[PDB]
Amino acid sequence: RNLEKYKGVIPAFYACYDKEGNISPEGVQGLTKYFVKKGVKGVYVNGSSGECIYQSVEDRKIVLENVMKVAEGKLTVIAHVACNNTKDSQELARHAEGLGVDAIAAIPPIYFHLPEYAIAQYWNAISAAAPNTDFVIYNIPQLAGVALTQNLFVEMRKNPNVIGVANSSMPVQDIQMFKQAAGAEYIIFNGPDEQFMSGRVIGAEGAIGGTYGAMPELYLKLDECINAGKMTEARKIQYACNEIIYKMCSAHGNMYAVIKAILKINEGLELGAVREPLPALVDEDMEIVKEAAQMICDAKKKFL
Amino acid sequence: RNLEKYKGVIPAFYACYDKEGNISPEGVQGLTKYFVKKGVKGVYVNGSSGECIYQSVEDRKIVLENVMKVAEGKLTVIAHVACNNTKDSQELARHAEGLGVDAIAAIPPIYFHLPEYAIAQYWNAISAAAPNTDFVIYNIPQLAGVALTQNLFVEMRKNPNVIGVANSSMPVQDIQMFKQAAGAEYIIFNGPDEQFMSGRVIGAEGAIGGTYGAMPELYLKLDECINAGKMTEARKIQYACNEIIYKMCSAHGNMYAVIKAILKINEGLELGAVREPLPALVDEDMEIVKEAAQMICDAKKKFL
Amino acid sequence: RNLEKYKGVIPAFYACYDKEGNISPEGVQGLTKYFVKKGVKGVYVNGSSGECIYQSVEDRKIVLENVMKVAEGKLTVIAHVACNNTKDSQELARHAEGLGVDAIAAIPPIYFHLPEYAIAQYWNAISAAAPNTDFVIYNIPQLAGVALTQNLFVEMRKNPNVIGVANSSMPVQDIQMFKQAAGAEYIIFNGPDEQFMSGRVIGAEGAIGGTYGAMPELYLKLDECINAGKMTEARKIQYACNEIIYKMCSAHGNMYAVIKAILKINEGLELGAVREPLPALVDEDMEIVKEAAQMICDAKKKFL
Amino acid sequence: RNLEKYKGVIPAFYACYDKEGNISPEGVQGLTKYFVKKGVKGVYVNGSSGECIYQSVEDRKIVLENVMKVAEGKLTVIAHVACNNTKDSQELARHAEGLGVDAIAAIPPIYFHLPEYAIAQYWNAISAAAPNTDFVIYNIPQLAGVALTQNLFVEMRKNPNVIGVANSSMPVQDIQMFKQAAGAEYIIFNGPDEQFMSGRVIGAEGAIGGTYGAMPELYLKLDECINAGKMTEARKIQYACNEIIYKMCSAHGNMYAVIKAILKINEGLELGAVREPLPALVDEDMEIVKEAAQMICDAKKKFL
Numbered sequence A, B, C, D: 001r002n003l004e005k006y007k008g009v010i011p012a013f014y015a016c017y018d019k020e021g022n023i024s025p026e027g028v029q030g031l032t033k034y035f036v037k038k039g040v041k042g043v044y045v046n047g048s049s050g051e052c053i054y055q056s057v058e059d060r061k062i063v064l065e066n067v068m069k070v071a072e073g074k075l076t077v078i079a080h081v082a083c084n085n086t087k088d089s090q091e092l093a094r095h096a097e098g099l100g101v102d103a104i105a106a107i108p109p110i111y112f113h114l115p116e117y118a119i120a121q122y123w124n125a126i127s128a129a130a131p132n133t134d135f136v137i138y139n140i141p142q143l144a145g146v147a148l149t150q151n152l153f154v155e156m157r158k159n160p161n162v163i164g165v166a167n168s169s170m171p172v173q174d175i176q177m178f179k180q181a182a183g184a185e186y187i188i189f190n191g192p193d194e195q196f197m198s199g200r201v202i203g204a205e206g207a208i209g210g211t212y213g214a215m216p217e218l219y220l221k222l223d224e225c226i227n228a229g230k231m232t233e234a235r236k237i238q239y240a241c242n243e244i245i246y247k248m249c250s251a252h253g254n255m256y257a258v259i260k261a262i263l264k265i266n267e268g269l270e271l272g273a274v275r276e277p278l279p280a281l282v283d284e285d286m287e288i289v290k291e292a293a294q295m296i297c298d299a300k301k302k303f304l
């Protein structure tokens, strides 16, 4: 199995709202054009970074449709289709296959801690609604409250559409164990942005992150140093990216609200705000937004 | 402030489905008639037990409408209105006020761990969409991933519609601390069914549970023994209820799937199945359903 | 099996030091005389409250010897004998049997998370070093990092010296499950002082606490109200005891440092300080010590 | 500040017992000779891997004395001196300085979750008992139950003897954050063996592990590939070491019991068993011991 189109930097795609807080087709297209021009491997659409939790099935369809209008044939497209219930997730998995996305992805069931067999049934029911599309399993125990165990992964590998795991848990051992267990026909994507270099070297051939969109060139360059085996140059970029993450996370407003504001300053992008309950930016946050935006420009000057 | 209508046994209302898996208006009405006949203080509608997580805003409106259509009697109605996003929760809080429910309730934001100010903003935005209705804060850290802290509770007590907390966390100290801090104009509802008697004596004047619907008379009798100060007889009913809970939880199928099946055997109620991803009953579960239904009949005979 | 001598209030015995920080035989004797005069059911010697973690095997022998030298009266003596390694725990279990203590107690192995079979081997090796003495399993997962599971408890009940569990975990369901499973020949001791009344009514016939020593009469009165079925008066004492606990815990200095200081003010007892690494009291703590000591006097006046 | 002598592979030194379970001076010397001949940077003496938790102050003195007789001037020596109480830890810190060890190390206080100021006081009291010796702080939240926070680390950096952190927590971000915060005059040691390569590239210039002693050459070679920037060869060794770890951890007997047994098979070393409560090997474990020992020989043949 050939998974080359999934190897590299795949930024998680942000939610693009107009001035009223509705999904902006124009906004979505503009952010996709930004990603095409920046030369990233692909986009991870309607994930946690895309505020999926807060969107309707229709909101999520519009996002993907407008992503495809611009990225179809140009970028690799992974659409996250998981919803609270199974029927909404199946509708999105069907819709995604209709647009010809490269892969569909799903986080586990949330809120309740469902047994392993219920998680496997949920994922396979989604996969069956898109029977010709590749499938990425999301391991995010911090948020979902349930983890992808080695046994659940063995069970999921029985589904031939399953191409691998997007690992957002903090231990890099999880990436190593998933990779070693699955072998060469599977791909592990690195989830913690702050550990990008560490996840990549231990076996993650993929990378999906929520902070990539704020500085795509830094991650591409980081990935370039990793591939070259230039670890000192990699370490130096990693520390600069993390220093920016910690700054974006020190705000009152949500990290994604900070990022959208940065993209206005650095790129003239109009992405709207964050959907409630995510906290919006306050006046005091503007200095944080400006300092982080400048840290990005300064890190690009220093490392590109 | 008078909170007498909230004191006593308030079973969490189950998700009543037709044979196609859609909300059954007929089904909802029948389960409401059941609770009226059982003489419970009220009903907690569209909570976790009512599979709220898996319902649409429209599904949740239909449930409440059909509950109210029958709750002409002595049912104190608490409608849980919290949804993944704020605008869906506001729509439900408005709709509930239009039907004249006694109170509205909300779990915290889920999946992401939002700061305290974002949680308070979420709850107050819901409360503002129903400005004349009483408000219940739901503390369920096991599932929501965030807890109602003492400071967040002090902050929420600034909202005059807030009448108290529905405490589902395991420490009874949480009930004691919330009660002591809030005083006499507030009510704490006991969430863990298995600790009913323990929560009640330390200060919970209310009780909301997901297993009450399966044996309402046992809990009413338990509450009667508590009020009388009959601790030995309370203990005997508590242990019998918990013995039934552990049996209902030993099934492959979800606890709520087991309960609906029991209500078919013991009360001829047609409630449908559980919505996916909740796991349905399997053939092996039929014996557990039959045995727990009998344990209920035998416990009623022994204690009523 | 008759366990009447273990039913009631059993304060955890504090580490009595001389002005040089060494075990005070005189000090120990004086605190034992205190508990005899206070009319408590017994004493729990060399537990976490007795700073066992920080004592040598010799320190722990001296404490028990001087307790026994005075516990001529009606003190049911439970000696905690668990040490980091097994051989130190066996030496203490043997020594305790030589002094004719009523029971020996043990926390699980700490620091490393040892499998269930290693925990059972540890406890049975201790029990075998005192083959004629009663045995108490201590469940304290917050501190030990391992919990007494239902299966480990079934395994331990094969040892005839095991008389029950001292439950310090926060869920009262743990007391209920241990009691229901073990039956009438076993005793469950209530560990969380702040939930005393809640633990007692759900099935704990015993009570061991670290704050009992600071206000023995309040707990005795609380227990008296419980037994009488006076839930309203029990609640009033419970809330007054918890209000004192939270005040004793608001200090910079360790809770046990605060308690010893209170016993100096209220009972003229000379108990020394707390052994490092436990933090000592600071100047700012004197007011908290003075206020909590007064809260104790005022609560005795109000409830006795 | 020059920390070159701490950079590289520093295996945690095992507890060497004679046939009765006492500390064997001859045994200790023999294991030190093994480490000298294998060409590792140094040894981490009386850590968790050296069963410190289960040793007396005298046991720990004998170990270090016999380590020094053989390693003094030849290997870098880091002695872990932390005990349950402060006075035992000070006695060991003094004793270690008397033998002229390169550095002393300490885990935080255990069992109780002590406030940050109590942890800092504990470590500085140890450091003051060895005022001319370098100091390594151990971050091991999984076992200690308390973590080294960024604030506690800022506080500890005020002590000029503090040379860095030995990070055993699972997130590599912890290594990155400690390093970035401390700068060039500090060293971070990698604790999780299974993430060696990942910890090293993100900023850990040091490495201390409990499995190093079982295959020193594999880790030295791994470290050599890392330094060369040969990441594919590094990944291949990492996966082979982890495959051996998982095998050593699948036994009934404790991982350290398995390692000592392997050193008997592969090196003819007589290290004794593990001190109770650590579980000993069973007959069924011998096949696991032999297979893992062979996996070591086969991995050395394949990668050296």
Ligand SMILES: CC(=O)N[C@@H]([C@@H](O)[C@H](O)[C@H](O)CO)[C@@H](O)CC(=O)C(=O)O
Binding pocket: A012, A046, A047, A048, A049, A050, A142, A143, A167, A168, A190, A191, A192, A193, A194, A208, A209, A210, A211, A245
């Ligand atoms: C816990 C979490 O949200 N993890 C993020 C990270 O990319 C995260 O934004 C980053 O590491 C900053 O903390 C992703 O793995 C998940 C994500 O972007 C998505 O699913 O949309």
Ligand SMILES: CC(=O)N[C@@H]([C@@H](O)[C@H](O)[C@H](O)CO)[C@@H](O)CC(=O)C(=O)O
Binding pocket: B012, B046, B047, B048, B049, B050, B140, B142, B143, B167, B168, B191, B192, B193, B194, B208, B209, B210, B211, B245
């Ligand atoms: C964690 C949880 O779901 N707890 C239950 C308890 O009533 C009960 O202990 C549970 O239903 C059965 O054990 C409720 O608090 C939740 C509930 O009824 C609701 O929110 O609808």
Ligand SMILES: CC(=O)N[C@@H]([C@@H](O)[C@H](O)[C@H](O)CO)[C@@H](O)CC(=O)C(=O)O
Binding pocket: C012, C046, C047, C048, C049, C050, C140, C142, C143, C167, C168, C191, C192, C193, C194, C208, C209, C210, C211, C245
């Ligand atoms: C976690 C903990 O230490 N709990 C205490 C409780 O008695 C009490 O809640 C605590 O001392 C004060 O809150 C006891 O169970 C421990 C104890 O007294 C002992 O082992 O000596």
Ligand SMILES: CC(=O)N[C@@H]([C@@H](O)[C@H](O)[C@H](O)CO)[C@@H](O)CC(=O)C(=O)O
Binding pocket: D012, D046, D047, D048, D049, D050, D142, D143, D167, D168, D190, D191, D192, D193, D194, D208, D209, D210, D211, D245
């Ligand atoms: C949690 C734990 O014990 N971690 C170990 C690891 O080296 C461990 O043995 C290894 O990663 C295998 O799991 C070390 O970091 C600690 C250690 O060796 C010591 O302090 O002696």
